[PDB]
Design a protein around this ligand. Sequence first.
Ligand SMILES: Nc1ncnc2c1ncn2[C@@H]1O[C@H](COP(=O)(O)OP(=O)(O)OP(O)(O)=S)[C@@H](O)[C@H]1O
Ligand SMILES: Nc1ncnc2c1ncn2[C@@H]1O[C@H](COP(=O)(O)OP(=O)(O)OP(O)(O)=S)[C@@H](O)[C@H]1O
Ligand SMILES: Nc1ncnc2c1ncn2[C@@H]1O[C@H](COP(=O)(O)OP(=O)(O)OP(O)(O)=S)[C@@H](O)[C@H]1O
Ligand SMILES: Nc1ncnc2c1ncn2[C@@H]1O[C@H](COP(=O)(O)OP(=O)(O)O)[C@@H](O)[C@H]1O
Ligand SMILES: [Mg+2]
Ligand SMILES: [Mg+2]
Ligand SMILES: [Mg+2]
Lengths: 330, 327, 318, 354, 343
Amino acid sequence: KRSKENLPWVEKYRPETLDEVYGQNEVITTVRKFVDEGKLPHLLFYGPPGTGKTSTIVALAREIYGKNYSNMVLELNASDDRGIDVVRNQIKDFASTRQIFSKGFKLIILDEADAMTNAAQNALRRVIERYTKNTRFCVLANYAHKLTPALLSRCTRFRFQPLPQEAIERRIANVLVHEKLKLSPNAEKALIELSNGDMRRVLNVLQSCKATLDNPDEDEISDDVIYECCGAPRPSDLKAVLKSILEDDWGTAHYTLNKVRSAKGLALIDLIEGIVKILEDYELQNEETRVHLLTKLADIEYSISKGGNDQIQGSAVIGAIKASFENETV
Amino acid sequence: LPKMRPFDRVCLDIQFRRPDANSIKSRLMTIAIREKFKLDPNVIDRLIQTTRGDIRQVINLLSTISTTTKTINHENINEISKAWEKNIALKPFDIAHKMLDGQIYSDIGSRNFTLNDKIALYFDDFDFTPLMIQENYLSTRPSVLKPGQSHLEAVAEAANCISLGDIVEKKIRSSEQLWSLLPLHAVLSSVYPASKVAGHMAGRINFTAWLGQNSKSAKYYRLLQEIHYHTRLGTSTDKIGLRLDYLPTFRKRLLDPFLKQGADAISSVIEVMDDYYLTKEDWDSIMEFFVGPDVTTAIIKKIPATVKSGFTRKYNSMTHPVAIYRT
Amino acid sequence: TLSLQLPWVEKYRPQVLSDIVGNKETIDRLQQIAKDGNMPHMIISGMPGIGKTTSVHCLAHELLGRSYADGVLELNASDDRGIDVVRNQIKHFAQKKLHLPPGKHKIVILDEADSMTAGAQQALRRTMELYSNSTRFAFACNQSNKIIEPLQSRCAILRYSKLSDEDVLKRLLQIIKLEDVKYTNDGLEAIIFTAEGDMRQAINNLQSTVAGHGLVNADNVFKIVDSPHPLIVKKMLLASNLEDSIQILRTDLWKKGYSSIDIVTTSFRVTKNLAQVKESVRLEMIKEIGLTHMRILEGVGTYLQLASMLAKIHKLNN
Amino acid sequence: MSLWVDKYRPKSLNALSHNEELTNFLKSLSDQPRDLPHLLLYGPNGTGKKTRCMALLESIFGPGVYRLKIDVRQFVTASNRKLELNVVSSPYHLEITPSDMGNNDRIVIQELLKEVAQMEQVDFQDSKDGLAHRYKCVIINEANSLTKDAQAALRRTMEKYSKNIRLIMVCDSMSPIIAPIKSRCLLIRCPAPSDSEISTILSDVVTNERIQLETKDILKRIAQASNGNLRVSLLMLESMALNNELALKSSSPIIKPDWIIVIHKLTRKIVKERSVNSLIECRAVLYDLLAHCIPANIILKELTFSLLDVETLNTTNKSSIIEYSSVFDERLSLGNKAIFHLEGFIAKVMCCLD
Amino acid sequence: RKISKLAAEQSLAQQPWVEKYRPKNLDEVTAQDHAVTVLKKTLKSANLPHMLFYGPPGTGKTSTILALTKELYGPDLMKSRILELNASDERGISIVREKVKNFARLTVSKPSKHDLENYPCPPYKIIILDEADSMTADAQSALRRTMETYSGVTRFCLICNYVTRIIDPLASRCSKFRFKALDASNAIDRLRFISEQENVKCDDGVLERILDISAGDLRRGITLLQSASKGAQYLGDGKNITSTQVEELAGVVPHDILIEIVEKVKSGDFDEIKKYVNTFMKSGWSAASVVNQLHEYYITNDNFDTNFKNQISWLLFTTDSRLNNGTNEHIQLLNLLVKISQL
DNA sequence: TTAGGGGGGGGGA
DNA sequence: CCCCCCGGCCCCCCCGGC
DNA sequence: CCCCCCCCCCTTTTTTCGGGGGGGCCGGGGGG
Ligand SMILES: Nc1ncnc2c1ncn2[C@@H]1O[C@H](COP(=O)(O)OP(=O)(O)OP(O)(O)=S)[C@@H](O)[C@H]1O
Ligand SMILES: Nc1ncnc2c1ncn2[C@@H]1O[C@H](COP(=O)(O)OP(=O)(O)OP(O)(O)=S)[C@@H](O)[C@H]1O
Ligand SMILES: Nc1ncnc2c1ncn2[C@@H]1O[C@H](COP(=O)(O)OP(=O)(O)OP(O)(O)=S)[C@@H](O)[C@H]1O
Ligand SMILES: Nc1ncnc2c1ncn2[C@@H]1O[C@H](COP(=O)(O)OP(=O)(O)O)[C@@H](O)[C@H]1O
Ligand SMILES: [Mg+2]
Ligand SMILES: [Mg+2]
Ligand SMILES: [Mg+2]
């Protein structure tokens, strides 16, 4: 902890103010309007991993209280003990007692509340209601099915969407400016494509790419660097493999698949995912083709998830695609 | 209940059954005339059926309704019965009877008794319902057979779904503790298999025999383990190999000689037992493992009592070797 | 700003029985009891946010008046309610000597009684019977089946049903008139539609929309309350072509951030209650959805698995 | 006295008589045993895997490996349950069967094996090279029955503590063994003895035991009926000699195990009658077999291979039977209650046959 | 009695070749440059992120992490800076909440002057959760905030074989490194070096055959090479190891038996196939190897049409999946052969 | 529509 | 110096979907 | 009185992790 430059990029670039959170304009604007007018309700932030829920709530707490927010808010998470006993004593006294420093209201942040037991959630029901005059509750979640209906009924819900392309591009530009790095346009497109709307993945991949360059100052990150560091198939490889499977014979298709996979040690699962993505845009005459493709490829992916023989799995992928595409003729 | 097992045969067991309507009709009429409200005697039976014979609940219902509704008649009996209808969970036998009824699986029955109700019926006792279904799904005259489908085919489909439900049950009770899969099990173990053989019970509803058989298997496996580790130093095999290969041969050197040489085979049998560090209890346990044509109960019983007494006397009047020294 | 505006759910919480909407017969019976007295042991059951705790508190207040402080013992899930508490605190409260009006009795409120352990419920049985002449018990719960039968036998039953859209509209209009909220008819219709019979949710959504957008119309209301995902899942499962179902899955659920586990659980729940479809077809769909859920729980929560589940469901109906 | 199957067991590598190539390979392994890797011996049951493992241990350490003792070890679970494990130990090696504790077998790997591996060899066990031995051998019998958690726990123990312990795992099939464990072991195939070798061994036993054989054809018949199982062959030879007054004739019948007879009766019952009442009756036979320590997998295998031997069935019936057998074998491997899967398999076979 | 303690070099000189030739530094890793370069750059960047190593068995994950720790902290400071937990240790939610968290919260051990002068000594410690795929979902979730809150003084490394077993939040929090399979094109140099240092004499292509048989596992190849060397030394004939000996030691079915099986399948008679398979299982051949060889023969044969190959690919996939669950080999092999015979 | 079999108790030729 | 009180490990039994 | 009919009520018990509750010793502290 000598300096912030020793931290991983995922933690070094954590937003500190609500203005540094990108891709959630609606939620940020609404929460800022609520806070400015002094009408903050009980909040629920539901979203997928790496969307900016924890960062957003921390920034909101820092804005409401300031630099010493950590001593004014009760933050609990899965790493801590959050049983019914903790709800009955710690949270209850925190909600029923005044602030030590200032004379404002009190904030309780239950991050990863989906990991809380049902008994604790039930106990929190009356805690939220009785002390609503001076206490506010924030619940952060990735899975809504783990939250009891009673708890959901007491909170106003905000959905964090997958990060749009523009926000990721702006954050990448900021990171490049800070790190004195050069990124190619195709490299940026590939980086955004493989992120799936997760900023942590983008930051980790960019940090890995910087370490790959021999001279990070005078060198630029190209699509080749991104593909090599992550060990992911290139679009050309996927196109060639699919074309060989769809138009060539069994021997040629098998040879092409093995040659493409051995040149860079590609993983079969990545090729399957890329081919599925490519085929999702195909206009097929018969629904049987789509049904067979989806079912057989899902079965192959499930089998791969448990190991098995790689060569047999690749042959199964080839055969499944070939048989499924035979329904497009009659 | 299991917790009441110790009270099996230590007290005089007296049973109080649900009171009949006639025995309480006079008291209800007296209470009604005393409380000054009008109740039609004909709706009494409906109220008593609503509470399942609970007199206290009947009196509470009267007290509550009389506050505003001063007349209890056929004009409002249905609403009162529905509002105050006790929701008591069924017992394994009742659950099995209702689940295996074809009426609820028909279009009208399905629209009346919905799939959610069927799933909830399983949750009345989720530990015994699948066992009852597996026990009683072969003892029905089905009324839901599809055209061209025989009873055996539906039985086979139900058995396949029961196997899948068993796999799901194994998944649930693992280290992962995937209890969120409990509802799916309900469909795979009770609802779907029942829907394939639902009909009229072709006999009496029996209690699951898997539990007693599992206990018997555990006892026999414990005995086999003790015997294998008693004979471990002399045999090169595992417990399964001992049961499947060694024991039949040991039968021809431990019990058969007594049937041919009479009481003159005690010495050889004792020598063989000592060579494998076997005890008399080990002998008895061995002789209980054989199955089918090799059952020994009658064979051992037919041995003269003098032979068995001499065997016991000779065994108890000698120093035998010990294999495992517990210290 | 370090100030908080009081939520309308608390600012406008009913304080008398006459201000509660829905369940007219039950509320009338409660008023009659509050008038005559002789309150019996009761258990109030219903779905969340319909006015059970409010009704219990209003009845207790209307019955006890200035004695509320000493004649009411309120316990909920946030307080310790073990067997020791029942045997010591509740017993002491029941045995306490308190002079009350001629036809009044002490009240023990047990909110969310469905969370109590079986031991405490068993212990309460004789306490209720031996002190019924001075104390009465009112339980409030969501699942009445979790209360042991011996306790249910000693208490009256009051089951609360969903509030009709008319009652929700009435209360929302009263609050709007008491708050000078600018609204449009479509906005109130959307609020009622998303509320799904929950008064608390409706009021919270209205307050959030007013504080965030000002004008309560359909557009602003839908910017605060998102479209219920169970209905989107039902549309996905009822689609005719596989392409339409896959489009619904991709555009409305997957790209919006909904997790695969949530999607599969909602699909199972919706399929379990799809009366339009025959029971056998629903059973096959449930088997397929259970296979997909088992695959997801093992770690493979990919979009391909959901697409395969949809393809299998469509194949079942073909 | 001691059964011939146990009285004539070889106790050295030079005493082996079948699969000479395997003997040569084992001798090559024993030439310089200091760098001996972990061993996994796989092959058909009853072929002599344990005998060859003991012979290898004797060659590495000496005859003292055959001086065996039995002790008891206590273990405590997370629920405070007390479990007992019987440990067979010698001055140079330790034999364990963790599957005796079922799902608790992991603890045996976590505590006992860890304790043994975290202890270096200090006793002066002078070897043939003139320097003392440095590792103790551990024999995990029935390694195929280990749960995946126990196998995962075994992974790092074999690597970090390879200088103190060398593991020898004997199994009948490598399918249940996880790939990481198979990667950490040297796999040794143990083919079953040929019929001629079995006949030679049986003739040697006959000569030593003074048994009057009318002809050598009886030994060939016994070997052919054992399907390569030498233990079964020897025990059947002993059984056939105690029913004919220690004199075997050409007309002496082959004795089958009782459970085999029950399974054949079940097969005939299934073939003759295909009905729900027949399935109910077969359920009783299945429960009876399972209650006397007859494994479900063995029952399924024997039933499948007895049904396929029926001469009145056509090719389609046999194909359906084998497909259902594969499916329900997978179900048994992935299930807990074996009776459910067995009943399902029998019902499907009855449906297909009828 | 007692025995004099052995030296580290002497002890290592008598260990199995897999442990004897384990990589000692990051430069000894053979075919993981795409990640090894990134890890090596952190010795100067001093910003090591949270790492998630995943890949097939025997690819060099544990060796890579151990070498990285040794290079970062050195022989003396490594012990106080590393906390290793694997599948052989209790790793429940309670352990994560108390032991792992307590270690993470602890201040980094004070480096000595020698360590600071000779090693980079980054200002953080490392927690290595080997075989993390065996941990329950709740325990994994318990690590989410511990990873981020105390990242200033602690870094986490999760090593697994099945990436799908890691909950999505942990994978997102960790930078992912995929270890590629080691084949004859990227691992021949290491095997050749090992053979040369062991004075192992083999014919041309023997090492390539060993690596092809290993199927991505270098540990298996090294063990097989050691077995072949031991056999050759026991024979004492001075001749070079041959590919047939390697195949015999690896359990590969002879080509003649494969041709006999293929001919039996071609015949199509159920009884003959059953009898031949019953005789075949008596030799102890592993079903997985037989299935792999059948796949290699059929898929690469020009004497078969497209439909036959399409069907046989799915048949082989189903058989392999069923075998991967720990099923009886005899029944599965018979079913596969019967199904192929009826194609 | 009532699974089969045993125990309770009011009515009655 | 010894008795009473009352907080703190250990232990054992019961749920687990909605 | 035995006989008849109807109705109600009984057949019977196995287990992988984590959390919560309830009872029992134990030992530290205060006090006389
Ligand atoms: N909207 C965003 N704008 C900028 N950076 C972001 C954003 N969302 C995530 N990040 C980056 O990702 C890191 C982690 O963000 P978090 O908000 O903690 O993840 P998360 O949304 O909480 O995911 P879960 O639900 O906890 S798994 C931050 O420190 C940023 O570097
Ligand atoms: N019938 C009703 N009439 C008017 N307002 C109501 C009604 N029901 C609920 N509300 C409002 O919603 C708030 C919460 O209702 P409560 O009755 O306290 O919750 P609830 O019905 O007990 O739900 P559960 O089961 O306890 S989670 C009240 O304070 C009112 O503002
Ligand atoms: N990349 C590599 N370079 C050199 N030797 C290697 C490499 N990978 C594996 N080995 C050898 O194989 C042995 C075992 O390697 P490990 O890294 O422990 O296996 P692994 O990658 O951890 O497989 P898992 O996932 O633990 S089953 C090492 O001691 C080396 O002898
Ligand atoms: N080389 C041999 N010569 C004579 N008998 C043998 C030989 N190998 C094995 N046997 C006999 O076969 C029987 C079974 O062998 P076993 O050790 O159980 O093999 P596995 O370990 O494969 O089951 C033993 O009782 C032994 O007497
Ligand atoms: Mg977060
Ligand atoms: Mg309340
Ligand atoms: Mg490793």
